[PDB]
């Protein structure tokens, strides 16, 4: 059907969404890692 | 009869549209997260230089 085609287009999109959601989650972990590096470097600067 | 089918396909097309826009917004969120990361890398390089 028309509906079989529309449901297959949506499934492909819903999986594209799922991978983008995991990429955002990994980017958010990176940012947390970068905040720790900043706090490390900043503390070691206060040792001046 | 056929009006049920007009509505069924309208529903399926609206579910797909919502997904295709969810994709579009996640793509913009990734772009914003990438800008943040670049900003954090510059702060790290600033702080690091000032440590030398």
Swiss-Prot record, chain B:
Expression tissues: Expressed predominantly in the seminiferous epithelium of adult testis. Expressed in pillar cells of the organ of Corti (at protein level). Expressed in brain, kidney, lung and testis. Highly expressed in the trachea, lung and oviduct.
Chain residue ranges for the region called Essential for homodimerization and microtubule bundling activity: 6-52
Protein localization: Cytoplasm; Cell projection, Cilium, Flagellum; Cytoplasm, Cytoskeleton, Cilium axoneme; Apical cell membrane
Disruption phenotype: Depletion in ependymal cells by RNAi completely abolishes the central pair microtubules and markedly attenuates ciliary localizations of HYDIN and SPAG6, resulting in rotational beat of the ependymal cilia.
GO biological process, one term: negative regulation of microtubule depolymerization
Gene Ontology cellular component annotations, sorted alphabetically: 9+2 motile cilium; apical plasma membrane; axonemal central apparatus; axoneme; basolateral plasma membrane; ciliary tip; cytoplasm; filopodium
Alphabetical UniProt keywords: Actin-binding, Cell membrane, Cell projection, Cilium, Cilium biogenesis/degradation, Cytoplasm, Cytoskeleton, Flagellum, Membrane, Microtubule
Domain of life the protein comes from: Eukaryota
GO molecular function: actin binding; microtubule binding
Entry text on domains: The Calponin-homology domain mediates its binding to microtubules.
Subunit and interaction comment: Homodimer. Interacts with actin, TJP1, CGN and CDH1.
Function: Microtubule-associated protein that promotes microtubule bundling and stabilizes microtubules against depolymerization in response to cold shock. Microtubule-associated protein involved in the stabilization of microtubules along the axis of migration during radial intercalation. Promotes the establishment and stabilization of an axis of microtubules required for the active migration of cells into the outer epithelium.
Further comment: Radial intercalation is a developmentally reiterated form of migration by which cells move in a direction orthogonal to the plane of the tissue from an inner layer to an outer layer.
Name the record gives this protein: Sperm flagellar protein 1
Stretch of the intact protein here: 176 to 227 of 234
């Amino acid at each position: 059907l028309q509906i079989a085609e529309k449901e297959q287009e949506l499934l492909a999109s819903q999986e594209t969404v799922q991978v983008l959601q995991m990429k955002v989650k990994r980017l958010e972990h990176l940012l947390q890692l970068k905040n720790v590096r900043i706090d490390d470097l900043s503390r070691r600067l206060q040792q001046a």
